[PDB]
Amino acid sequence: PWVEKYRPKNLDEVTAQDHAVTVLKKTLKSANLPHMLFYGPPGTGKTSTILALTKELYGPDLMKSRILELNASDGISIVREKVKNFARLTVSKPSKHDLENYPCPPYKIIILDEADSMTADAQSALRRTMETYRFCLICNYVTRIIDPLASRCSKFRFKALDASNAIDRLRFISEQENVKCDDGVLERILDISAGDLRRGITLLQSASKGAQYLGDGKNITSTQVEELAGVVPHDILIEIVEKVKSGDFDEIKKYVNTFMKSGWSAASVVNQLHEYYITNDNFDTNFKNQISWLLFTTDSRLNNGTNEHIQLLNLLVKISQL
Amino acid sequence: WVDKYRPKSLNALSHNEELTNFLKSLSDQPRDLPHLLLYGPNGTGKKTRCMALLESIFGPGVYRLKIDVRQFVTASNRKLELNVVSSPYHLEITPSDMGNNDRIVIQELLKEVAQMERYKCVIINEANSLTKDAQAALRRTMEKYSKNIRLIMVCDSMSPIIAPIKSRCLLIRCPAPSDSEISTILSDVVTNERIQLETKDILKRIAQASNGNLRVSLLMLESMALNNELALKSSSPIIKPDWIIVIHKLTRKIVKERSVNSLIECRAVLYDLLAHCIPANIILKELTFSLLDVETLNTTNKSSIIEYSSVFDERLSLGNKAIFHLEGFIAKVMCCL
Amino acid sequence: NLPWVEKYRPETLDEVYGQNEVITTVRKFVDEGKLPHLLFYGPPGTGKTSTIVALAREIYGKNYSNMVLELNASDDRGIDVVRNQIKDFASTRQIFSKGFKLIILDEADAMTNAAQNALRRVIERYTKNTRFCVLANYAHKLTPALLSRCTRFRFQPLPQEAIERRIANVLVHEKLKLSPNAEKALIELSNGDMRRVLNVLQSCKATLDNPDEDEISDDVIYECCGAPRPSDLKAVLKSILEDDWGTAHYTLNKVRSAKGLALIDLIEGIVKILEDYELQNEETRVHLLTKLADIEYSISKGGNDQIQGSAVIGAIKASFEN
Amino acid sequence: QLPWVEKYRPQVLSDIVGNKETIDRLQQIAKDGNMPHMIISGMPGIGKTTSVHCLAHELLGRSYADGVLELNASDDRGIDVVRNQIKHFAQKKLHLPPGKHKIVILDEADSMTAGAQQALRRTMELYSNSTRFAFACNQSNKIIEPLQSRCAILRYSKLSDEDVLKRLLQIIKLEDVKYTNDGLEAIIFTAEGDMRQAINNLQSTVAGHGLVNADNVFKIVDSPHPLIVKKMLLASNLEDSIQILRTDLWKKGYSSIDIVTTSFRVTKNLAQVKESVRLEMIKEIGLTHMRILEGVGTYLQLASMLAKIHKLNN
Amino acid sequence: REEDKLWTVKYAPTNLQQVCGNKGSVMKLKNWLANWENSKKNSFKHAGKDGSGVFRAAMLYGPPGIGKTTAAHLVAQELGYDILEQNASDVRSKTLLNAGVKNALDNMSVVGYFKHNEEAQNLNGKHFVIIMDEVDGMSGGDRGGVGQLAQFCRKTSTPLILICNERNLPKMRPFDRVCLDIQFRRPDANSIKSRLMTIAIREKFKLDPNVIDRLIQTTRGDIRQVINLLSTISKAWEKNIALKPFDIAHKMLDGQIYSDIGSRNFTLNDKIALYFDDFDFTPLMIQENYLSTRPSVLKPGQSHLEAVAEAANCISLGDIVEKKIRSSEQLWSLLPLHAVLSSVYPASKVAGHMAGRINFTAWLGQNSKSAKYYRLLQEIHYHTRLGTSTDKIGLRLDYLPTFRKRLLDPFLKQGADAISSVIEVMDDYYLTKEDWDSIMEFFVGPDVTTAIIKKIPATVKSGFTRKYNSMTHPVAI
Ligand SMILES: Nc1ncnc2c1ncn2[C@@H]1O[C@H](COP(=O)(O)OP(=O)(O)OP(O)(O)=S)[C@@H](O)[C@H]1O
Ligand SMILES: Nc1ncnc2c1ncn2[C@@H]1O[C@H](COP(=O)(O)OP(=O)(O)OP(O)(O)=S)[C@@H](O)[C@H]1O
Ligand SMILES: Nc1ncnc2c1ncn2[C@@H]1O[C@H](COP(=O)(O)OP(=O)(O)OP(O)(O)=S)[C@@H](O)[C@H]1O
Ligand SMILES: Nc1ncnc2c1ncn2[C@@H]1O[C@H](COP(=O)(O)OP(=O)(O)OP(O)(O)=S)[C@@H](O)[C@H]1O
Ligand SMILES: Nc1ncnc2c1ncn2[C@@H]1O[C@H](COP(=O)(O)OP(=O)(O)O)[C@@H](O)[C@H]1O
Ligand SMILES: [Mg+2]
Ligand SMILES: [Mg+2]
Ligand SMILES: [Mg+2]
Ligand SMILES: [Mg+2]
């Protein structure tokens, strides 16, 4: 996969997040690299920067000896018997070839990922295991982790990337893998994968490896990308909005039946309808009020795991009654 | 009958040439087979496509399969012994027999199966009945074991699926079969079983009455072939299952009579339908979509019925006693009409 | 090196602020010697733990480490804990001491009904030879029997005078410069939480301690704490009230995306601003409050955030039309 | 110091006030002797444990120390315990009067795991000649079906106001304390049936402020004053209600749960408004309560509740 | 003594003609226990006339308090056997089962020998009947108990009788086919009524038949609960301790209570206390009988139907609240709200005069039936999964209508020679006779099969059974 081949392995390949690398480079020259708490939206590059700094400061051979990676599996016995032990293991002796190139600090690195849904007792033990003997723990909701941990660890908000700095790197990928793409496809992959970036890379990889089966060598057109991510195409959405713009109950019911039967079985049509009805400039304010309210109501209904056919039919009938 | 003529290989599928082409293209790279997420309406033939892709990548020995039992230890002292239908090269998990042990049993069984030894397939039937904890554990296993486990998740209307799952697998949709292809696949069956068809319109009629449901169309054709002495003529009284007739009679009673003296019988019929292994959401959906087809109603009544049904569907998905919400919906319907 | 939470912890009674009403009655209890079972409840970061530890230290002095049992949350919470540890600590006597022993449970509201029944039975058993003092955050998650058996004490949040006195004190023992509006923002954000104040002060310290003498402006405090700025809030409200749909939507998206704010605090600040407007019609306020409460309750379950944002805009624009 | 709840705990079966038919049934049981296995269910603080204790005392006379086995939540009740100790106690020899029997009192039976409750079945069925079980549970639903089938179910109704008032009158008469009628009414309002909590609050008021008066009660209970809650709910202008909720209740640091519970308990006693408006206001208040209990206790929810209540009352 | 014993123990049955209800299952168990010796002589391979000759052990199951233990003990004692009983109050682990009972599996009794061995009464006096009672009640402290007992179900040498409450529980899966499983059902009201009349005549005190029917409806058929409740003993008794839910339903549905003069005499607090009087049966009773009253509180322009609709809406809201409450008991504080939404508001909306009689709630029986049928459908799917590739819910929805046309449809027209074809069909899916009956049980609607299954001659059914007992193809693992 391309996500691991072109994973940022050093501190300068990252281009989306810039506010977080400068301060770590500033702290680099001192042995006072403290405990730290990374948080933000998924697919931002957090683990990439963590692995990059560990590789830059510790060396390739020692990666598995003193740099440890732990995740969210199923306990307290793990902390009291292994994680504390892993914290108090006598660090291995970095050989001369390591000192030749890498300045070694006098402490170990233990990476606990997904610190969000952890139990408070494990945290009360983990603060003690880290204070008496460094750590880089990660979560996506800072509210759930207890305060005694965040007291000694300095916080870093890994901001979600914007549409501006995300293109060039993606463009770089299009040059690095000899993938032939269409003209207006990159920003489409960006907006369908808005916020997160690794999903865009997986989408590009899937689209390339799928189009290559056809043997055409043709530009990967946008409909392939829109079909891969499961979003409803623009033609079917145009048909829906045209049918609902002026139509009786029977025609809307029959068309939504055909849609739920053979059409795109995703419930993302409400998102496309919201985007189209809000970003448009043809409907007045009193219309958009009820449009937004009905869309919110239908989304709150669909969020409860109910049936999508009835909710979609109700939403279409209500948006037609206006 | 219906299981008799079922494709056991990619060459044997006579529907949706595009998907068969994509599947035979995927089956040419056994070393790299990404995780798959199949979605689409019921009765479309996605499990058949799973077991046919497995037949094409592996040997024909995938279809011989046996059921085993494996034991795990939960949080409490109730050590669970759960069944699993497996094959020499794959296994199937249906997380509907258990309700809350999902996030534990999924991760534990997957981590045990990853370490028994070139990979093994795990088909998660009904991948929409997994709570967010179960899906989180599933994505954890997907991140951990990528060299020996290849998940092929079968589901329908994949809205209740967390985004890290969607990102880490290839999404595939299986549209319902058009009436034309249903006609051909039914002609194949009536030819192989020497059925005396009077005309070819009965096939299109069954296809239209099945609402794009392939297996329901086949089952209805078989059920109606055992009533006319295997001689299906133009006078074909299309037979519905034993429960749809009761729902249609209840709809006719609701439309014809609007009073509490009829509401008592409606509650009795709802009891009789619910006690006999029929869910609540299916009853509500069927009653709603049968109350909208009546000709005696106008647009306002239908627009109110659909709203009441949309509200009571959430109320059914939020409560534990279904007869309460069903009777409330019927009462509101009778109040509107 | 020690956190300011622990470093600035009150060692005595006089070092707690803004709790005179309970401190006077606690001093009456301790000099009278009739210390009953206590229930210290209130918002977090108020001083319950500090108060009770200071009282125990004053009562027992050096023997505090002998007759004071400081228990905590679950820590493998079986019935065995309440059945053995507390029971033997209450039934067995003490050596080389005079008085009754003290058991203090931290956040004892996370106990199930059975655990609370066991604990109330233990309290009723040895009520003559030991005194219980239980801490809590919400006084409603406790069995009414356990609440009645003891005397309650609600720790109201710290007013301006107390927190400003503590800021002065932390400015004595630290070399720091703080702007007059920085403390105002700090109090407006604290809500009366001393723990969060001590959390944010040292973080901004470590952030801007280049010469140990910089001025802590409000922007860096807002960035470290992650709270909305009143200027951005008022700008978003004005844009939603006056400008059209496209412009207001773009401004809301840019504000909540370029800063890293969630819709919760957006709605909170917006309704807090709208509280004091001179409205003409009351139906406006009715619809506004009802719809925004519905939006908040739906956000609490995590829907499609863009749809709830559009719904917020629509509700604000549709309520302000009378 | 001594808790008045413990000092004035009823020791005879006649001293218990409240339910009359069930107390008469227990009196006839203690007079006859043929007591069957019985589950006692009801709300907390209404006299369940006291009832079975006085029953066992009056039944066994001078044998309570020999033929009574009490197991509350503070004791180990697993599978090993119910298998060894309860069985060995049921098989014990004891020469009792021709009517009496041994007594095993299990308190908070709803806390016993299902595996432990399964073992007691044959133990209580085979030794019905010299052992009668008495369970005291809050919820009769967590008890397994076989146990519920074996022993008779006895429900205790919540205490009314005249009974608690008479009990408090007896207490204050035997304690010689000064009081006022509105103070007793405040005690009745806050107790909501809990006789134990009523006695505890009365003792706390007497020990803290001496004179039992509504102001001292509402000060010591640390709950929103019912008068200010009634003024907030019955205001004419919605802005007035919002301001009252802001400057009086929300600023003083009251918990939202307490505010909603006090609004519920005041709307229940608002005898000036009609019945339908009372029921619908209670419905909206309960909706807000359920919304708060789900993690969102924002002031906005209370503001919306007040807005809905004002729109309803208008 | 005479007056110190309980009413359940003193009035317990003594012979087999006093056990009320389930005569068929008792007779089947007795015949199996009687012909067990002849089946043992033939190596447990020739099913004689009832398909109950290949089964080594028997399994009793059903609702609580029907007579399972009593029937087992009585049929064991009547044939002259010696009873070796083990229950849940004994540690039935794997090692202890191997130690204690495994050794006594095939041995002969010493008490049975020294009791009576000179008179020619019966040759089965020394033999054992091992009664494993409360097998469903094995907690986590009995490791491997189910597997070891399933192994004991085979390779045994003495009649083994297992007793449980929920047979279709997946934990009881190892007892799939190795044991004859007969089912006890809730006895008919007539037998329980006759037993109650006999007990009341012996105790010399008369009751109203309406009270007896109301008791039978309240206890849902548990005869033990009925006797234990009758032992508590007339208007005050039924109106204050026994039939309290009915009084709550009658008082909360009165029209004069919600009138202004009436509401000032009976305020809302009295109604909420009336609900708390029994907070487990009042909502169900209200939901049962809220739409069968002639109202007197309708607004000026409100019909019956829309009032009932609003009541049902508030009922659904109260049900949601009840689910939220029971999801976490520590939310006890939500009980008052559930009082107004579930019980008080609908009654207030549709109060008035009772049209007929107040009926007990029917939701409990329907819920039990639905759970039993769900478990039966899951058990059928466990067998038929290897040849359908369908969900446990879609099976009942789609396949069974065709299974009816395959299984029973030949019998109505072809008579009795189409047995081979239907056995061949049901063996492609690993289906058995109990599964056949369970399948036919489900057909609700115009395709009801309970009338037709009995209409067919008994000779055809007996021939089907005896022909199926010969050939079997159940192995697929
Ligand atoms: N700034 C970036 N530049 C280039 N590639 C990036 C960048 N950020 C993320 N990626 C890619 O996205 C992948 C995601 O890796 P991670 O750092 O684990 O993301 P994440 O934020 O940890 O997601 P989680 O673990 O679900 S919270 C990386 O391996 C890169 O391939
Ligand atoms: N009244 C106070 N005066 C001075 N410092 C205080 C005060 N309240 C809190 N602090 C500071 O905040 C820290 C935490 O105080 P705690 O008493 O532990 O909080 P709490 O009020 O007991 O509630 P918790 O700990 O969140 S459950 C103390 O160590 C002090 O540094
Ligand atoms: N009917 C009553 N008459 C007089 N005092 C009563 C009455 N009911 C309760 N009390 C008092 O309340 C105290 C506590 O009652 P208990 O019976 O112990 O409570 P409970 O019924 O066991 O409910 P729990 O234990 O909280 S679940 C008794 O010691 C009495 O002082
Ligand atoms: N058919 C019956 N006729 C009369 N009394 C009966 C009948 N069945 C049960 N009883 C009474 O119920 C008492 C005990 O019933 P059991 O059969 O032992 O209960 P059970 O069937 O074992 O159900 P479990 O084990 O409690 S789940 C007997 O002593 C009788 O008093
Ligand atoms: N290409 C095909 N040719 C013939 N029958 C098919 C084909 N695809 C699917 N089917 C029918 O679909 C049925 C299986 O449906 P299934 O996959 O279980 O539904 P679902 O997709 O809802 O799980 C089979 O009985 C088979 O007859
Ligand atoms: Mg990561
Ligand atoms: Mg503290
Ligand atoms: Mg008690
Ligand atoms: Mg029994």
mmCIF file of N, CA and C in Angstrom, chain E residues 390-434:
data_model
loop_
_atom_site.group_PDB
_atom_site.id
_atom_site.type_symbol
_atom_site.label_atom_id
_atom_site.label_comp_id
_atom_site.label_asym_id
_atom_site.label_seq_id
_atom_site.Cartn_x
_atom_site.Cartn_y
_atom_site.Cartn_z
ATOM 1 N N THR E 390 -28.968 -17.980 4.532
ATOM 2 C CA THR E 390 -29.937 -16.935 4.821
ATOM 3 C C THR E 390 -29.842 -16.574 6.297
ATOM 4 N N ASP E 391 -30.320 -15.381 6.631
ATOM 5 C CA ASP E 391 -30.301 -14.902 8.004
ATOM 6 C C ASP E 391 -31.377 -15.601 8.824
ATOM 7 N N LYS E 392 -31.201 -15.577 10.147
ATOM 8 C CA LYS E 392 -32.159 -16.222 11.038
ATOM 9 C C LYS E 392 -33.535 -15.578 10.971
ATOM 10 N N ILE E 393 -33.622 -14.339 10.497
ATOM 11 C CA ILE E 393 -34.908 -13.661 10.367
ATOM 12 C C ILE E 393 -35.503 -13.867 8.981
ATOM 13 N N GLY E 394 -34.680 -13.766 7.936
ATOM 14 C CA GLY E 394 -35.175 -13.987 6.588
ATOM 15 C C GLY E 394 -35.651 -15.405 6.352
ATOM 16 N N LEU E 395 -35.166 -16.355 7.156
ATOM 17 C CA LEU E 395 -35.617 -17.738 7.034
ATOM 18 C C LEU E 395 -37.125 -17.843 7.222
ATOM 19 N N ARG E 396 -37.626 -17.430 8.388
ATOM 20 C CA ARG E 396 -39.060 -17.455 8.653
ATOM 21 C C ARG E 396 -39.831 -16.611 7.647
ATOM 22 N N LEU E 397 -39.212 -15.544 7.144
ATOM 23 C CA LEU E 397 -39.920 -14.622 6.264
ATOM 24 C C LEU E 397 -40.123 -15.223 4.877
ATOM 25 N N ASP E 398 -39.146 -15.985 4.386
ATOM 26 C CA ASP E 398 -39.182 -16.421 2.994
ATOM 27 C C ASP E 398 -39.286 -17.936 2.831
ATOM 28 N N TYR E 399 -38.422 -18.698 3.506
ATOM 29 C CA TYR E 399 -38.271 -20.115 3.187
ATOM 30 C C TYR E 399 -39.485 -20.926 3.628
ATOM 31 N N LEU E 400 -39.949 -20.705 4.856
ATOM 32 C CA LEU E 400 -40.991 -21.551 5.437
ATOM 33 C C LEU E 400 -42.267 -21.659 4.606
ATOM 34 N N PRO E 401 -42.766 -20.602 3.934
ATOM 35 C CA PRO E 401 -43.918 -20.788 3.039
ATOM 36 C C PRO E 401 -43.705 -21.882 2.002
ATOM 37 N N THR E 402 -42.474 -22.013 1.502
ATOM 38 C CA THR E 402 -42.174 -23.081 0.552
ATOM 39 C C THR E 402 -42.006 -24.418 1.265
ATOM 40 N N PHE E 403 -41.441 -24.398 2.474
ATOM 41 C CA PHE E 403 -41.281 -25.623 3.249
ATOM 42 C C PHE E 403 -42.628 -26.263 3.553
ATOM 43 N N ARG E 404 -43.656 -25.439 3.769
ATOM 44 C CA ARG E 404 -45.004 -25.967 3.947
ATOM 45 C C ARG E 404 -45.467 -26.715 2.704
ATOM 46 N N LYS E 405 -45.215 -26.139 1.528
ATOM 47 C CA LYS E 405 -45.599 -26.792 0.281
ATOM 48 C C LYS E 405 -44.803 -28.073 0.065
ATOM 49 N N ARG E 406 -43.594 -28.135 0.619
ATOM 50 C CA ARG E 406 -42.767 -29.326 0.461
ATOM 51 C C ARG E 406 -43.112 -30.401 1.485
ATOM 52 N N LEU E 407 -43.220 -30.021 2.757
ATOM 53 C CA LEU E 407 -43.337 -30.996 3.836
ATOM 54 C C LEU E 407 -44.736 -31.588 3.971
ATOM 55 N N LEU E 408 -45.737 -30.750 4.235
ATOM 56 C CA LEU E 408 -47.061 -31.235 4.608
ATOM 57 C C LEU E 408 -48.036 -31.310 3.441
ATOM 58 N N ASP E 409 -47.835 -30.515 2.394
ATOM 59 C CA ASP E 409 -48.754 -30.453 1.263
ATOM 60 C C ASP E 409 -48.928 -31.829 0.615
ATOM 61 N N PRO E 410 -47.865 -32.628 0.430
ATOM 62 C CA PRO E 410 -48.081 -33.997 -0.075
ATOM 63 C C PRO E 410 -49.019 -34.836 0.780
ATOM 64 N N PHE E 411 -48.959 -34.688 2.107
ATOM 65 C CA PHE E 411 -49.738 -35.553 2.989
ATOM 66 C C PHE E 411 -51.238 -35.389 2.789
ATOM 67 N N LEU E 412 -51.693 -34.183 2.443
ATOM 68 C CA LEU E 412 -53.130 -33.952 2.331
ATOM 69 C C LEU E 412 -53.705 -34.616 1.084
ATOM 70 N N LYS E 413 -52.903 -34.737 0.028
ATOM 71 C CA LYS E 413 -53.367 -35.292 -1.240
ATOM 72 C C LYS E 413 -52.826 -36.681 -1.537
ATOM 73 N N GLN E 414 -51.522 -36.908 -1.360
ATOM 74 C CA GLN E 414 -50.948 -38.210 -1.680
ATOM 75 C C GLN E 414 -51.276 -39.272 -0.641
ATOM 76 N N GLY E 415 -51.720 -38.882 0.549
ATOM 77 C CA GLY E 415 -52.069 -39.845 1.573
ATOM 78 C C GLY E 415 -50.915 -40.267 2.460
ATOM 79 N N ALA E 416 -50.448 -41.509 2.298
ATOM 80 C CA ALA E 416 -49.452 -42.059 3.208
ATOM 81 C C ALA E 416 -48.311 -42.782 2.500
ATOM 82 N N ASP E 417 -48.232 -42.728 1.170
ATOM 83 C CA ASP E 417 -47.107 -43.337 0.469
ATOM 84 C C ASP E 417 -46.002 -42.343 0.136
ATOM 85 N N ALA E 418 -46.236 -41.043 0.323
ATOM 86 C CA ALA E 418 -45.240 -40.018 0.040
ATOM 87 C C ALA E 418 -44.292 -39.788 1.211
ATOM 88 N N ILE E 419 -44.199 -40.751 2.131
ATOM 89 C CA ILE E 419 -43.326 -40.599 3.292
ATOM 90 C C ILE E 419 -41.863 -40.584 2.874
ATOM 91 N N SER E 420 -41.479 -41.458 1.942
ATOM 92 C CA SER E 420 -40.083 -41.536 1.523
ATOM 93 C C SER E 420 -39.610 -40.211 0.939
ATOM 94 N N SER E 421 -40.449 -39.571 0.121
ATOM 95 C CA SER E 421 -40.049 -38.324 -0.521
ATOM 96 C C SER E 421 -39.847 -37.211 0.500
ATOM 97 N N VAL E 422 -40.748 -37.099 1.479
ATOM 98 C CA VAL E 422 -40.628 -36.019 2.454
ATOM 99 C C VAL E 422 -39.465 -36.274 3.406
ATOM 100 N N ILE E 423 -39.178 -37.543 3.718
ATOM 101 C CA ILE E 423 -37.983 -37.825 4.511
ATOM 102 C C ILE E 423 -36.722 -37.484 3.723
ATOM 103 N N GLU E 424 -36.689 -37.832 2.434
ATOM 104 C CA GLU E 424 -35.551 -37.463 1.599
ATOM 105 C C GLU E 424 -35.362 -35.953 1.571
ATOM 106 N N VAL E 425 -36.464 -35.208 1.454
ATOM 107 C CA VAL E 425 -36.381 -33.749 1.416
ATOM 108 C C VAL E 425 -35.850 -33.208 2.738
ATOM 109 N N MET E 426 -36.448 -33.630 3.854
ATOM 110 C CA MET E 426 -36.042 -33.111 5.154
ATOM 111 C C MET E 426 -34.669 -33.604 5.590
ATOM 112 N N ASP E 427 -34.097 -34.599 4.910
ATOM 113 C CA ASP E 427 -32.736 -35.026 5.208
ATOM 114 C C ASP E 427 -31.673 -34.280 4.412
ATOM 115 N N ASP E 428 -32.051 -33.544 3.364
ATOM 116 C CA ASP E 428 -31.080 -32.669 2.718
ATOM 117 C C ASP E 428 -30.765 -31.435 3.550
ATOM 118 N N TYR E 429 -31.532 -31.183 4.611
ATOM 119 C CA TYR E 429 -31.336 -30.011 5.452
ATOM 120 C C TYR E 429 -31.059 -30.383 6.903
ATOM 121 N N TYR E 430 -30.797 -31.661 7.187
ATOM 122 C CA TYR E 430 -30.540 -32.139 8.547
ATOM 123 C C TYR E 430 -31.703 -31.808 9.479
ATOM 124 N N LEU E 431 -32.921 -32.073 9.018
ATOM 125 C CA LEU E 431 -34.128 -31.778 9.773
ATOM 126 C C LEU E 431 -34.666 -33.043 10.429
ATOM 127 N N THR E 432 -35.265 -32.873 11.606
ATOM 128 C CA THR E 432 -35.826 -33.968 12.381
ATOM 129 C C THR E 432 -37.332 -33.769 12.553
ATOM 130 N N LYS E 433 -37.958 -34.673 13.310
ATOM 131 C CA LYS E 433 -39.403 -34.610 13.510
ATOM 132 C C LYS E 433 -39.807 -33.464 14.429
ATOM 133 N N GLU E 434 -39.081 -33.266 15.532
ATOM 134 C CA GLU E 434 -39.361 -32.124 16.394
ATOM 135 C C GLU E 434 -39.196 -30.822 15.621
#
